[PDB]
Amino acid sequence: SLELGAADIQDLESFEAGRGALPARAYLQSDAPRLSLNGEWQFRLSPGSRVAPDDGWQLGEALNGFESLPVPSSWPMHGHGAPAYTNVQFPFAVEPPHVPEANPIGDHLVVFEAGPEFFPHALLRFDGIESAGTVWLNGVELGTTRGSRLAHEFDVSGILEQGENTLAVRVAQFSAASYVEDQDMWWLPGIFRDVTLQARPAAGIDDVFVHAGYDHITGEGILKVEASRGGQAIDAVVRVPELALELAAGTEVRVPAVEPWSAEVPKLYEAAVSAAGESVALQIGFRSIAIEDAQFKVNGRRILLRGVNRHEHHPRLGRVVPRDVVEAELRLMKQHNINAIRTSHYPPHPQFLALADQLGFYVVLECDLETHGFESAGWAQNPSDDPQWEDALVDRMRRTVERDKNHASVVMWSLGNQAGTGRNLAAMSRWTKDRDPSRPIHYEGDWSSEHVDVYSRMYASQAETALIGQGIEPALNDAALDARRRAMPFVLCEYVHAMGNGPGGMSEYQALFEKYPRLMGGFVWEWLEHGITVSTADGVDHYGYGGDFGEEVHDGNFVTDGLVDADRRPRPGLLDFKKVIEPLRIDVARDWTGFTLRNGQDFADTSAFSFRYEVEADGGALDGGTVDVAPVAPQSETVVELPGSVAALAAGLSDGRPAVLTVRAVLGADSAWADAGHEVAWGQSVREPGAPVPPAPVEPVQVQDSELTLGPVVFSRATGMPTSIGGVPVEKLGLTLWWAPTDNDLGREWGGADERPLATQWKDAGLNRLHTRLLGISANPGQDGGETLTVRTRVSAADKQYGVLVDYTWSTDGETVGLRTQVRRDGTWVNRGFEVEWARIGLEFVLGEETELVSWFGQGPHQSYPDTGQGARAGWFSLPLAKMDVEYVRPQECGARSGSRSAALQLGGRTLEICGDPFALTVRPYSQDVLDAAAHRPDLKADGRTYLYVDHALRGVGTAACGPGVLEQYRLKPRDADFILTLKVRS
Amino acid sequence: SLELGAADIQDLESFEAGRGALPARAYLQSDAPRLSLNGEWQFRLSPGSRVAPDDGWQLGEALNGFESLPVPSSWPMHGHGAPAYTNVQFPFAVEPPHVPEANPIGDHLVVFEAGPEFFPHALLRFDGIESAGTVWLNGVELGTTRGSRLAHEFDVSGILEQGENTLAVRVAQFSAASYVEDQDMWWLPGIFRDVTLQARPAAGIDDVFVHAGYDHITGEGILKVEASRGGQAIDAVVRVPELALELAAGTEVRVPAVEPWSAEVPKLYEAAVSAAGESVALQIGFRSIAIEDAQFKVNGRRILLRGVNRHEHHPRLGRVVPRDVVEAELRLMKQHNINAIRTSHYPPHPQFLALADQLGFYVVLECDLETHGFESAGWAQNPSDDPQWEDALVDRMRRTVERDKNHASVVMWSLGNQAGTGRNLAAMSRWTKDRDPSRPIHYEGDWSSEHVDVYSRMYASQAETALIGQGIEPALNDAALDARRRAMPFVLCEYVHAMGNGPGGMSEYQALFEKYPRLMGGFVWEWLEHGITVSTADGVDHYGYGGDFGEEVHDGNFVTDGLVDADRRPRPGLLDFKKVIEPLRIDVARDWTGFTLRNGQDFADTSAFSFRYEVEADGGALDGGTVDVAPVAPQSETVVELPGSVAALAAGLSDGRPAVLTVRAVLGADSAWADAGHEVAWGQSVREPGAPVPPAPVEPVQVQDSELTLGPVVFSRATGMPTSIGGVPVEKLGLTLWWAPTDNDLGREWGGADERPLATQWKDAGLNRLHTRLLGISANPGQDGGETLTVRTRVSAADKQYGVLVDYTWSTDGETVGLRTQVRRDGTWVNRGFEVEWARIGLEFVLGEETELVSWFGQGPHQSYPDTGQGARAGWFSLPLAKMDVEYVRPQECGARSGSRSAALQLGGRTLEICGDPFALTVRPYSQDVLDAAAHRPDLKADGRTYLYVDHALRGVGTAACGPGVLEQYRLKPRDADFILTLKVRS
Ligand SMILES: OC[C@H]1O[C@@H](O)[C@H](O)[C@@H](O)[C@H]1O
Ligand SMILES: OC[C@H]1O[C@@H](O)[C@H](O)[C@@H](O)[C@H]1O
Ligand SMILES: OC[C@H]1O[C@@H](O)[C@H](O)[C@@H](O)[C@H]1O
Ligand SMILES: OC[C@H]1O[C@@H](O)[C@H](O)[C@@H](O)[C@H]1O
Ligand SMILES: OC[C@H]1O[C@@H](O)[C@H](O)[C@@H](O)[C@H]1O
Ligand SMILES: OC[C@H]1O[C@@H](O)[C@H](O)[C@@H](O)[C@H]1O
Ligand code: NA
Ligand code: NA
């Protein structure tokens, strides 16, 4: 046997959960001496095990080949190799437990000093190594690590020396464990969480298990704090000063009056558990979880989960998320009405849990297990059902549960994600139910729900969710399993996939969640885009995605699918989500005399809020103030009268003049997660402006050799299009039916005979390449010598027989211009046997000047499409042109402002004003073809023109990249249509 | 009505066949004064009719805007606009008769002088204008032209002036006629054929209709020459000196003994038809065409059509083909055994016909009509069935027939191509049968064959062709039409689509053509690639195809689909086609005592040929000479004994020594189309070399720290691959299963549930991204202390569970190296529910040095794949590395030499020699990934290495880009396999 590296590879191919580590336990704050070994280490990278040197480097001998590297790190974020993104597909041949030859091996070394406080006993702790570590101290092998996002501790007693010590860690990127770590995220090897030396004094405390329940009938807490050392229960004293408690560890007591913990009111009691040689500090939240009457209840009440799936990602550091970024992102979540987090799909940094306890989130704490890449082979060889993997998978669940079991915020344990079904998942569930019956078990992969306590799905349609909400879904074949599942509450562990422009359809889910007790709510996929900061050859920073790092196989921009970008800047979807899930409902009366207020919270009343009103008109705010609202109980409602000055204004306003009344609930005082005045909920009542009044057509058409003039409009006799309006140059005017496909439009809409993505349907139909033929131009008699001008055109595409006849009728009184557009289908819009849907029915004006500022009356400030824009409120808005865009990583259709009634574009020294019945407004400095072709933001370039889109109709954006497409009510099928606009130019 | 250009556009949208032209007539060589107006004209281009100036330019006033342009020309070939390629799809919206707004309008002007010989009567002739011309002379509008490849003449009597004249022609690229001119070719506007002034003397001859039949029973000619002036029969004298004839025009006579015309023996008789004021010169070929007993017969005998489809294209001049290029390409066709031409899909230059008469080709002369782009809408609005188009389509057929009716080479009239079915095609057929019953009518678009005389198909499979050949195809529903069609002879007007590497499957068609009298033969699609010469930014010339000229819609490289490149350089397909269709069959006896000879000609005996033999061995020619063969009658065979010295050599050769006997039929004397010694047919008998003798394994394996040595081979202990063989550096050795997709592999194979192109099947299966895992390396006991080395590997792809186990066993005696490769499937090669076919089972050696010369024993000199290579004969070959490649316009798999038994690569100062049972040999200076990624030849770059492919199995190439894919016998399904090679390095 002559090949090199055989012993290293046999270890990497092991089915065992590693070796040599101390038993799994909780992460505990203790007074035992602690030394962090994080800092600058030495690092050497080899391309695989067979060439990784065996040169005594573990002693500090072979310094050459090594260079400085920060630890913790994801090493490809620091110039060593490259990140690689795959969604489902494995990046290596699927033949478990074997590893590919190209397998980056990273050797890490650090020298540190240990004082006498670390003797006689100490351990070394590793909070995360992706994916396989072998650890040596002073040349002695301590053992190995498996379970990339799980903690391992090694006893160093008798190996650690007083004074200098040399720690060496060989990390393999790929191992047998990679087959059970196939999450949809970047593959990033490294020692990516804390490395800590901890003294283990005699008569200490190794593990603690807090049991802190709440009896909602009596208001009592139920407390038992177990404590152990070396696997044996120990005498220890538990002190909870705020509750006047001093009790023995291991005894259950009833605490007469506790304030219970919830995400809404995250009450924590400081406690200490003390033995002779060590004391542990705890924060105890009293809460009990129950499943009863097909409802998920906390402290005796059904709750509504307004959730996100949170991965750990940083655009420059990879899987290392600095604490300040964590704290800020959790506050950002609370600022957007989120109350729940799923740790997709592995345990988070150990210090995350205390922050969730403190700020208040219901947490689904998920084990590091995902075998999704076996699905393509019908789950053949799936680790979850293979006996050889049982110990490894039970170990993952054990380490997951033991680490985080003391945290009130953890309300459910999840077995993993997309791991199929099998005997080892059942073993993990059995182990967990025996160890910790206080928390229900979650796992979506087995729809029969045989081994879980809630029924979980991902991306079930709104329609199917309504059936489940009513308890009327189709039955499982096994009547006993059906009876069990039908009596379970239902959660969407992933829904409304938030990739690109979207997600559409959030309101339809939310109405169901709020109506049906069996529906627990849902967790958006996902909180963040995993963009990675890169730069062009000219130094322009932007986010990269799959394939931008030379990957042979990858899934492109499916890793940029979040509510916020990788720097935690909100996408429009987050602003809409905040509104959709707002925990108070404010319904303002049409007559402005008051509002109905529903408190949708589960535990808190409305006393935390200040209720403010404001009336705005074109000239600015006409009135505003606060109203005193007697606190409304959870799940109750009331009617609140507004001050008489508000209704007096409504009465006084001349009909047709626009005005907006907004009632908002803001924090009355600072909280831990936002300042006083932070807006939580709002409602409005709008007095809409009258429809536009087209001008009397009293100006005649003047005929020149090559142009026509009609008041302030000049037209080409060769094209029929305006070439200037009030001196604003017009390069082109034409009909639009298409937009640059969103990420959702690039997804297949399964079901029905046509499974092409909408983008492909449009391409095949030629909708991305429309052309216009001029049929004729004629003047018609107007008023008092004036005339109208009708330009007749037909729009179609090369090689197609279908078209739309489009007639433009122009009129003017010399100041205002009227434009009537009439669209009539000429032939059936069917291509390849299927109907061709449209993106819009609108006009594109290409103006020969740049726009500095865009103002409008409608909704805003951010974009809105028919099935989004919940967060866009009625009002007057004004933005610099650059701020109208949306910085999606892959540029795509975005930035439309639906529901507009008037718009004004400042183009140098002139203002172009447009009025209509509701229209969508978009303004860009580059064309739709530039937007479509661009794969990253630096591909966009301004060309000196203004591209102005006025849409009479728009389709929705849906979630077709993963889950439901556009719901029927928001689809735009071909139709005939007519609409009027008025235009004016002010100088 | 205020738009510009309305009158011009109404004319362009006219359904009429133009206006003002003289009646259609023959192209006739006459003694009337003729002046060619070809030369340097003045030219101005506008983007459409609405902006095309009406500035009096027709008089020579508006010189500015005009620049010099050669006429004839295709104007986009001279920097004015750009060529655009579409196959089927129209490049404009389909709404006949309307034209798009973007419609290049080219104004052409020339001043010329006319002497007194052009008075009182003269005409102007235009032999082609694409697509719509309006003609003025001295400011007077003569009329308009429709039918782009048809001739028009205009009377200029009373308009032409003695002295200076100004001719003006406005040409529109697009018109209503574009809807009936949708051939698969470049769209190229221009005045692209001759412009001629012709005097029309009094008492002259306007038209002549030659009728020249042949009675094969008596050997007599049947002659009648009709002559007319102004539509009336005239007295004229017909003189045929070689036949001693002086007769009146309009009288039918029997000529006692004529030598008949055929493509094989194109006998022409010079004749003159003379009236008082004009004489016409003719070449008369006597031949009669008959359909009888379901056979197409000429001069009483069934013929076999060995044909090509000939478009008119030049890579720098467009639709203008210089006469010297025409003459050379026709000789090239004859040099490759072609005897028939289809003028796809329009009449050729008028002077082509005399060349076909003279050189000898059976011509299918096809009308300028193709409406293929209406098929996508179910033929809705198809001009062929629309009454408004009747006059226009009958006019096209009339002009087609009248121009060329006097030519013996025209044996069938074709109505057009891919024009669907309809009443106007029936009208065209009726008109033609009435006007010229001497020629059968062809049209493939109506499979019922109701209005034609032969049954024509395009790309019918070999299987379906065999059924038709036997008269057993499924019946038409109408019993009367079925009886008619079943009694028709059958032609493939297009078959064996010759795009890229291919066409495969030619032999299977040819065997049927030769076996079944009803099968007339076939015309390859197509003679030439329509490449257009372009240059890179660095000045590297190459051919461009669709999309290389900025087209919005195009069909890519489907215009480069020929047997020769646009400069008439043969592709390998032409060399194979020549052999497939060779008109003599030479079957050499295994014992080298003689050969059987079949004369497959229809009229000629074998007296034109010299029969030569040659015996070659490794050292060179051992013997050769000529053998006297008594002339063999058409369709007969004989046995010919070879000189005894040949068999004496065979007897004397030691068994296992290779030797090749080749018998060839060459021209004994110069012909009009090739020189004496030109090879027409050949056959061989091969004494094959013995199988390779692997060495005695008497050298042991020497183990070093990181390498192993086994005689002259060094191996890496990290990869198991050789790193040098005899000092030749080896960068990589591995198994191959894939090749860079050919044009055929990018085509869909219709039928069955899987219609992905093979290239897509491979991509989805990961066959283009295989990786290898090392399982182990071990030494085994050899002989007398020696050892063998077995390297065990597994080949698979990321995210797939299927693989192949590949074991390499190495042995050496210190000079020769033995390599045994064993391949075993591990799991089923099924992906997306369908079996994954392989391109090959072979080895790729990547050598770290450049190869200067490649030599081999096998077949050659050109490439061969399992279903091609008919033209590659057995022998010894040697080529510089560059000449091993094939210069396809889109680079793709090519250059394999199948059937090799030994190869030698000269790499600097060393020669690497390889021996095996039959293997395919390929050698390249760039990798397969470079070949696949390259879209044009300058994308290929040498990297300083040698890529050597040794294939134990290869799949065929088929014709799946259009028509049959690889036939079952040539497909390569996954299998287990083993094979032996020997290697030696000589310094
Ligand atoms: O777990 C390791 C990480 O822990 C975070 O809390 C810290 O802010 C980061 O800098 C890094 O050290
Ligand atoms: O003010 C900036 C941000 O800071 C928070 O503290 C505040 O409460 C939020 O509403 C947000 O506006
Ligand atoms: O009359 C203006 C027209 O210009 C053409 O160049 C274009 O193809 C048409 O779609 C239309 O825009
Ligand atoms: O028909 C026009 C063409 O005719 C060819 O015979 C000639 O060689 C070309 O130069 C061009 O004049
Ligand atoms: O010799 C060059 C070429 O020229 C032809 O005249 C000859 O007959 C052909 O066989 C070809 O070889
Ligand atoms: O042992 C050599 C190997 O090297 C790796 O880098 C490659 O992925 C494998 O396919 C194989 O070539
Ligand atoms: Na884009
Ligand atoms: Na290629």
Automatic annotation (TrEMBL), chains A, B:
GO terms for molecular function: beta-galactosidase activity; carbohydrate binding. GO terms for cellular component: beta-galactosidase complex. Residues 709-984 form the Beta galactosidase small chain/ domain. Beta-D-galactose 7 binds at residues 771-772. The keyword Hydrolase applies. Beta-D-galactose 2 binds at residues 184, 417-418, 458, 561. InterPro entries: B-gal_small/dom_5, Bact_Beta-galactosidase, Beta-gal/glucu_dom_sf, Gal_mutarotase_sf_dom, Galactose-bd-like_sf, GH, GH-type_carb-bd, Glyco_hydro_2. Beta-D-galactose 6 binds at residues 334, 337-338. SUPFAM superfamilies: (Trans)glycosidases, beta-Galactosidase/glucuronidase domain, Galactose mutarotase-like, Galactose-binding domain-like. Keywords: Glycosidase, Hydrolase. Beta-D-galactose 1 binds at residues 21-22, 24. GO terms for biological process: lactose catabolic process. Its EC number is 3.2.1.23. (S)-malate binds at residues 289, 291, 433. Beta-D-fructose 2 binds at residues 226, 228, 435. It is an enzyme of class 3 (hydrolase). Beta-D-galactose 5 binds at residues 194, 323. Beta-D-galactose 4 binds at residues 184, 494, 497. It catalyses: Hydrolysis of terminal non-reducing beta-D-galactose residues in beta-D-galactosides. The keyword rRNA-binding does not apply. Beta-D-galactose 3 binds at residues 184, 417-418, 494, 962. Beta-D-fructose 1 binds at residues 22, 24, 399. SMART domains: Bgal_small_N. Belongs to the glycosyl hydrolase 2 family. This is Beta-galactosidase. It comes from Arthrobacter sp. 32cB. The lineage of its organism: Bacteria, Bacillati, Actinomycetota, Actinomycetes, Micrococcales.
